[PDB]
Amino acid sequence: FSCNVDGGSSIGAGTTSVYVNLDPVIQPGQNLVVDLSQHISCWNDYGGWYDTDHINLVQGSAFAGSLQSYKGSLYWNNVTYPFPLTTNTNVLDIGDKTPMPLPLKLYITGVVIKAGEVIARIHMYKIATLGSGNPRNFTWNIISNNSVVM
Numbered sequence: 001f002s003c004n005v006d007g008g009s010s011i012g013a014g015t016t017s018v019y020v021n022l023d024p025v026i027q028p029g030q031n032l033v034v035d036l037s038q039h040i041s042c043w044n045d046y047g048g049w050y051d052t053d054h055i056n057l058v059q060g061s062a063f064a065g066s067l068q069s070y071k072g073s074l075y076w077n078n079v080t081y082p083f084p085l086t087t088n089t090n091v092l093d094i095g096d097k098t099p100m101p102l103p104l105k106l107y108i109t110g111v112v113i114k115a116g117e118v119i120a121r122i123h124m125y126k127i128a129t130l131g132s133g134n135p136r137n138f139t140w141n142i143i144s145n146n147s148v149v150m
């Protein structure tokens, strides 16, 4: 099982930065959408649904540092969860070698967000089908490319 970010080199586990464009200006009523399907894709390393991968997001996934006070929602694979995540999400099954963009969106409710700032840490868990399933942990550190004001 492997993923990449913005079509980059393969990732089998660990923490990776994911850079996103955010609305440069917001008013207190406005909530920011962060469509992570535009950046993260994963695939089965055999294809053919032979040793199928099972992926979910993990309890404890949350906003980072400054935004710990923020509220939001996390859309994952047909369900919209409160964010930060207080439970593990449903499982997405990955069996094709053709990359699947992750069905993952984050909704977030002067300068409030800095470019280069980690705004959320999303923990993802993988376990396959054969043997022990060779479980792996991924963390996606979501970082804004730009300032967001007000």
Ligand SMILES: COc1ccccc1O[C@@H]1O[C@H](CO)[C@H](O)[C@H](O)[C@H]1O
Binding pocket: 001, 002, 012, 043, 044, 045, 046, 047, 051, 052, 053, 128, 133, 134
């Ligand atoms: C990059 O690693 C691989 C390269 C080539 C073929 C298989 C590879 O890893 C296996 O992939 C499987 C299907 O995704 C399952 O995820 C196994 O658990 C994992 O060991």
